[PDB]
Design a protein around this nucleic acid. Structure first.
Ligand code: MG
Ligand code: MG
Ligand code: MG
Ligand code: MG
Ligand code: MG
Ligand code: MG
Ligand code: MG
Ligand code: MG
Ligand code: MG
Ligand code: MG
Ligand code: MG
Ligand code: MG
Ligand code: MG
Ligand code: MG
Ligand code: MG
Ligand code: MG
Ligand code: MG
Ligand code: MG
Ligand code: MG
Ligand code: MG
Ligand code: MG
Ligand code: MG
Ligand code: MG
Ligand code: MG
Lengths: 117, 201, 64, 143
RNA sequence: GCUUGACUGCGAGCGUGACGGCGCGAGCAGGUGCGAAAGCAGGUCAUAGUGAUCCGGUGGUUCUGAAUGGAAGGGCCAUC
RNA sequence: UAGCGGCGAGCGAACGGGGAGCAGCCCAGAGCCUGAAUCAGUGUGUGUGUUAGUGGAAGCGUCUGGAAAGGCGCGCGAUACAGGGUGACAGCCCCGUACACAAAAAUGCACAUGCUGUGAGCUCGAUGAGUAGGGCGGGACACGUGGUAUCCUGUCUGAAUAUGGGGGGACCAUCCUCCAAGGCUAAAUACUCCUGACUGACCGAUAGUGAACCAGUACCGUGAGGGAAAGGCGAAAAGAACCCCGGCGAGGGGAGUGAAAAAGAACCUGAAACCGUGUACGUACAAGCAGUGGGAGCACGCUUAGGCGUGUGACUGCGUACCUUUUGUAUAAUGGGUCAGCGACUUAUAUUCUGUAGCAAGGUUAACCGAAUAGGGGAGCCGAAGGGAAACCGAGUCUUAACU
């Protein structure tokens, strides 16, 4: 029972090459190079599912800081005031309000200031 | 146990040990597989690095050329000549314990009775060695794929069945495990039943 | 082919009832005047093979 | 019960190790041999009894005893065998006829193993003290 | 001063070694010395002073003894 | 296993048992006797086989299609539904197949006979000398000179002779058994250059022979010798009349053939590396394993948008390939120019353990026989008892004068 490897080998190689579309030069054409690139890409993606969470929180904090200082308080003190006032709105929502509803953000700041007093 | 005769409408007393035992699938499987293994003709061979035609001259010198070292033109790595583990003619037969063989037959026969695949008759014969005669007889009995087992092999019956692909005619001493399972229906004459009982005991 | 027995081993070890092997003690062939009687007396009877060495003995004696 | 319905019993057929067929298998690359050394080489490994160069155990210990040659032609008979002779008289010839001892056996001894429940006449065979009592209790005679 | 316990067969139980091994040991049987006796003695205050297996040698012992009776050779015990 | 063995690595019987197949004779001599079997050759006559051959059953309609053997619907043959071919898959179209037959001539075998060489039977004899054995040196025996029997003989010697001699594993006695120094002999056994038939959980063009093809060729070597690559148009050549550009070219465009010419001979299918033309988006102030996470704009679809889908991706966070070998590699340590095809834990026989199945104090047969995966065959092997170096004893036994 001799087994020829042609049909199966072709299918495996095409699978990897399909995932390498868009890559530069040999990275999207040659199997040896394409395989390494596909593996690397997956390794970055696993790491970046975690990094995405870090970067977005960092962005929200920066926007809250700016909006709060426009109302005359720093981010650090603003967060403390909300905690003392038992407000549980998270940073994702706070950053959204800071950009779209500036009146509502002012009301939040006043509540924080009252609690700190 | 009583096996009702289809033609005579009369019961035939048979042993419960042979026709009424439970079905041991694992036992039957082993015997069936061994039978197929015993039919294999293991005739094949390939050439090793020693049997390929060629000289034993070293293709090029060990050191100096920037080429991978070589020693033989018949190396299995090289095109033309090789086969690392070349096949040799081999025997695939397996040993079946005599008791295990007989036990498998009893299970098969008992299962046929439960599934209503065993038809017992007094006699089964044709007047002339004519295929047309046999075909009509089977059609009357609503049979197609059938293994006919007789006490004595009738020459006329044997001749009439040669050209019927789905019909096999055998004697009691010729039963084999695969045949009993392969055919849809098994027709046994009264005499055949008795011989089978004594054989299997 | 059939496994061959290490013949030297077959002359030094004998199988017992439960599957162990008995052997004769060493240090009782020559140079005996200097040895104490107590020491020599304890070497005379046959002894059993230790657990660590059983594997080696079994390999040498496949038909024991 | 059809040829495409029969199945083996669970546990009867294990697969079999296939070495050097990838990382996922668990036996890829080195194939369970580790790294380098004599034991990783094709056809490599030391002979039976080799312990490095240290004098091996089977050469460190002294040889003892001799083979008898008389033991080869001596057999022992159990009390259970006494009833298989078919005749009631247990002799060297009758035991051989019943395929109990062997054609070359010349001396035989009956020992207390099993039980005898039928009068038997043992002739020309040594009998142990325990066996003698058992045979006589069953109604036999040791000639 | 008197002596041969620098005894023979064994040995509960331990110590120490990968193993081959090595070490300590009350008590039991036989026979012994010293002491009035209880008792003590299986070498030396203790820890170095040594060499596996094979192949042979010497003495003892029918255990074996290739048709049988012997014998040769082998085994076992002591020893080189 | 018993043994042999720097008692190391290793080497390794026989007795006895089960089978296949079986067959016994002649000279060393003279009478009585004669062709008595038999074998060899040469005739003849039979039987059978080989080397050319002969006959050999039974189907149509309709649908799809280039074409029917396919679908559907009704029939028929079968001692023939082995196989092959035919414009796609045919028991009934063709060649066959089962079955039944056939030889002028040559020849094989088995017989019956003819002839020739032959020469039984009986009685009384006879019984293989430079030999057996020995000394020396070697070799062969499972047996390495060992306590070493037995066999062979290069060298030197050397008996007895049926009232005798050989062997029974040093050797001697007793007993048993056989008769060397002359020679024939079928079967069961080994093998395949070659011939025919049939088969394969054997290969299918880098496989299988080195060789599917004008291959032991081309080519290489003074020579011995070494030794390739290379298969497929179509059902049928129907293999492209004629016209046009061109050098009365190469090559191409029409026409025509065909189911198909993007089946056109550089011909089935026609992958990948590699090289082009066209379109969308990006790109000429921006520094690194070239991705990954976020993300504007543009193009094209969709949907009445609806932050949808596809392509591209300015700007920005993070980010030094893979394998191997190492205490440790982005390492300036090793390996790979790329693609496609091939390329490495197998097989046989023993032995032990685990799982699973059968049977169970029992289990199981090997060769072989066989109507052949049945059945027969229990020769054997393993287990149900151990202790002891062994004789031996035995649920005990060894140790010791004897064991608490
Ligand atoms: Mg050479
Ligand atoms: Mg090849
Ligand atoms: Mg059988
Ligand atoms: Mg000694
Ligand atoms: Mg692992
Ligand atoms: Mg390595
Ligand atoms: Mg290492
Ligand atoms: Mg290692
Ligand atoms: Mg037997
Ligand atoms: Mg015809
Ligand atoms: Mg003579
Ligand atoms: Mg002689
Ligand atoms: Mg001579
Ligand atoms: Mg003798
Ligand atoms: Mg080829
Ligand atoms: Mg091809
Ligand atoms: Mg032209
Ligand atoms: Mg083509
Ligand atoms: Mg640059
Ligand atoms: Mg280094
Ligand atoms: Mg690093
Ligand atoms: Mg590098
Ligand atoms: Mg560099
Ligand atoms: Mg390189």
């Amino acid at each position: 029972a001799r087994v020829k490897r042609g049909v199966i080998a072709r299918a495996r190689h095409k699978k990897i090459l399909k995932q390498a579309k868009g890559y530069y030069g040999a990275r999207s054409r040659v199997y040896r190079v394409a395989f390494q690139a596909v593996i690397k890409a997956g390794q970055y993606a696993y790491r970046d599912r975690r990094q995405r969470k870090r970067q977005f929180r960092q962005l929200w904090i920066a926007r809250i800081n700016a909006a709060a200082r426009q109302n005359g308080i720093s981010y650090s003190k603003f967060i403390n005031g909300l905690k003392k006032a038992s407000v549980e709105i998270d940073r994702k929502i706070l950053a959204d309000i800071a950009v779209f509803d500036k009146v509502a953000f002012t009301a939040l700041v006043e509540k924080a200031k009252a609690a700190l007093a | 146990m009583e096996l009702v005769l289809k033609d005579a409408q009369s019961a035939l007393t048979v042993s419960e040990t042979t026709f009424g035992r439970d079905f041991n699938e694992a036992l039957v499987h082993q015997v069936v597989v061994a039978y197929a293994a015993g039919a294999r003709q293991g005739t094949r061979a390939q050439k090793t690095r020693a049997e390929v035609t060629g000289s034993g001259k070293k293709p090029w010198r060990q050191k100096g050329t920037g080429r991978a070292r070589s020693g033989s033109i018949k190396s299995p790595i090289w095109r033309s000549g090789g086969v690392t583990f070349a096949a040799r003619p081999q025997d695939h037969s397996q040993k079946v314990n005599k008791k295990m063989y007989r036990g498998a037959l009893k299970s098969i026969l008992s299962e046929l009775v439960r599934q209503d695949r065993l038809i017992v008759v007094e006699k089964f014969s044709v007047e002339a060695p004519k295929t047309k005669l046999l075909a009509q007889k089977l059609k009357d009995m609503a049979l197609e794929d059938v293994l006919i087992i007789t006490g004595e092999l009738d020459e006329n019956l044997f001749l009439a069945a040669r050209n019927l692909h789905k019909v096999d005619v055998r004697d009691a001493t010729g039963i084999d495990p695969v045949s009993l399972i392969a055919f849809d229906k098994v027709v046994m004459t009264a005499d055949a039943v008795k011989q089978v009982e004594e054989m299997l005991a | 082919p059939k496994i061959k027995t290490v013949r030297g081993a077959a002359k030094r070890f004998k199988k017992t009832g439960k599957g162990g092997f008995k052997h004769k003690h060493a240090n009782l062939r020559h140079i005996l005047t200097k040895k104490a009687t107590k020491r020599k007396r304890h070497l005379r009877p046959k002894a059993m093979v230790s657990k660590g060495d059983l594997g080696l003995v079994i390999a040498c004696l496949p038909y024991a | 019960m059809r040829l495409n319905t029969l199945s083996p019993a669970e546990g009867s057929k294990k697969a079999g190790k296939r070495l050097g067929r990838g990382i996922g298998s668990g036996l890829g690359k080195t194939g369970g041999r580790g790294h380098k050394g004599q034991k990783s080489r094709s056809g490599g490994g030391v002979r039976r009894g080799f312990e490095g160069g240290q004098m091996p155990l089977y050469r460190r210990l002294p040889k003892f005893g001799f083979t008898s040659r008389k033991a080869a032609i001596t057999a022992e008979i159990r009390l259970s065998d006494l009833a298989k002779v078919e005749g009631g008289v247990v002799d060297l010839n009758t035991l051989k006829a019943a395929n109990i001892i062997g054609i070359q056996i010349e001396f035989a001894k009956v020992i207390l193993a099993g039980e005898v429940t039928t009068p038997v006449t043992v002739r020309g065979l040594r009998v142990t003290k325990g066996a003698r009592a058992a045979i006589e209790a069953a109604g036999g005679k040791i000639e």
